[PDB]
Design an enzyme around this catalytic site. Structure first.
Site, PDB file in Angstrom:
ATOM      1  CG  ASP A 161      36.978  38.907  28.151  1.00 43.44           C
ATOM      2  OD1 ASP A 161      37.751  38.074  28.377  1.00 43.44           O
ATOM      3  OD2 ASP A 161      35.948  39.269  28.537  1.00 43.44           O
ATOM      4  CB  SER A 164      33.280  35.725  34.487  1.00 49.33           C
ATOM      5  OG  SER A 164      34.220  34.853  33.998  1.00 49.33           O
ATOM      6  CG  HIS A 176      37.448  38.399  32.049  1.00 48.02           C
ATOM      7  ND1 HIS A 176      36.515  38.137  31.267  1.00 48.02           N
ATOM      8  CD2 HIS A 176      37.563  37.959  33.209  1.00 48.02           C
ATOM      9  CE1 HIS A 176      35.912  36.974  32.067  1.00 48.02           C
ATOM     10  NE2 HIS A 176      36.452  37.070  33.210  1.00 48.02           N
TER      11      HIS A 176
END
Length: 263
Positions: A176, A130, A208
């Site tokens: 995502d 991330s 995600h």
């Protein structure tokens, strides 16, 4: 013949096995001991040898725990791996880059003798989830001595990574909605030069959170990438190239690369 080859010879599944063949131990790094990052856990092989080292960052909120499974499954294939906490969980990608750097320098210069004796200072890598993946692209873009970078579902405001020369595998997730592949991972992949070793692997049916609501595909291709580029281990080339239907189509969306990567 390679100085850097470690471990029994790879079969396909086994990289899918929860556990790699190296027994693993723990060194806990408190916040007090961590200068420029929030602490973490070092995973390292019990068998005494010299291994490449890897630092892994979490993303926005989360933790250590977010990425633990990953750091210790990697260590079980023959690496010294630190999974960090950041100074705060709201830290931005660029600071996470600094903290990754500080985490590497901790393992080489500040940890116990047991940890430092296991690391080959010259053979380092970075990964992250991330914003942590954005931090690793930033760090990669400023330390062309790094042997590999693996951004997992990466997020960054800067989409131009055309100065990164470090072998980079980007892992995206089709579902995502947080760091969408369209506007994060794919643009980053395209911006990377055409003349460096790079690959893009997109998960199918993946949020995600797969690098933390996970499993066998990331572990497998990340270890194969680290083996090829951190260890110079050409035995792992055939997992990467062509990357055929790969760890599997519908587990795998798609897979670009600049294979064969200077055999």
């Amino acid at each position: 013949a390679n100085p850097y080859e470690r471990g029994p010879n790879p079969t396909d599944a086994l990289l899918e096995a929860r556990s790699g063949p190296f027994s693993v131990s723990e060194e806990n790094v408190s916040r007090l001991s961590a200068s420029g990052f929030g602490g973490g856990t070092i995973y390292y092989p019990r068998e005494n040898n010299t291994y490449g080292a890897v630092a892994i960052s979490p993303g926005y909120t989360g933790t250590e725990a977010s990425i633990a499974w990953l750091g210790e499954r990697i260590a079980s294939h023959g690496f010294v791996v630190i999974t960090i906490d950041t100074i705060t969980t709201l830290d931005q990608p660029d600071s996470r880059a600094e903290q990754l750097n500080a985490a590497l320098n901790h393992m080489i210069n500040r940890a116990s003798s047991t940890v430092r004796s296991r690391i080959d200072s010259s053979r380092l890598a970075v990964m992250g989830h991330s914003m942590g993946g954005g931090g690793s692209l930033r760090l990669a873009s400023q330390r062309p001595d790094l042997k590999a970078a693996i951004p997992l579902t990466p997020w960054h405001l800067n989409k131009n990574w055309s100065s990164v020369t470090v072998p980079t595998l980007i892992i995206g997730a089709d579902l995502d909605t947080i760091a969408p592949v369209a506007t994060h991972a794919k643009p980053f992949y395209n911006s990377l030069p055409s003349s460096i070793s790079k690959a893009y692997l997109e998960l199918d049916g993946a949020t995600h959170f797969a690098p933390n609501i996970p499993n066998k595909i990331i572990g497998k291709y990340s270890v194969a990438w680290l083996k090829r580029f951190v260890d110079n281990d050409t035995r792992y080339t055939q997992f990467l190239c062509p990357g055929p239907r790969d760890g599997l189509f519908g587990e795998v969306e798609e897979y670009r690369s600049t294979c064969p990567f200077y055999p």
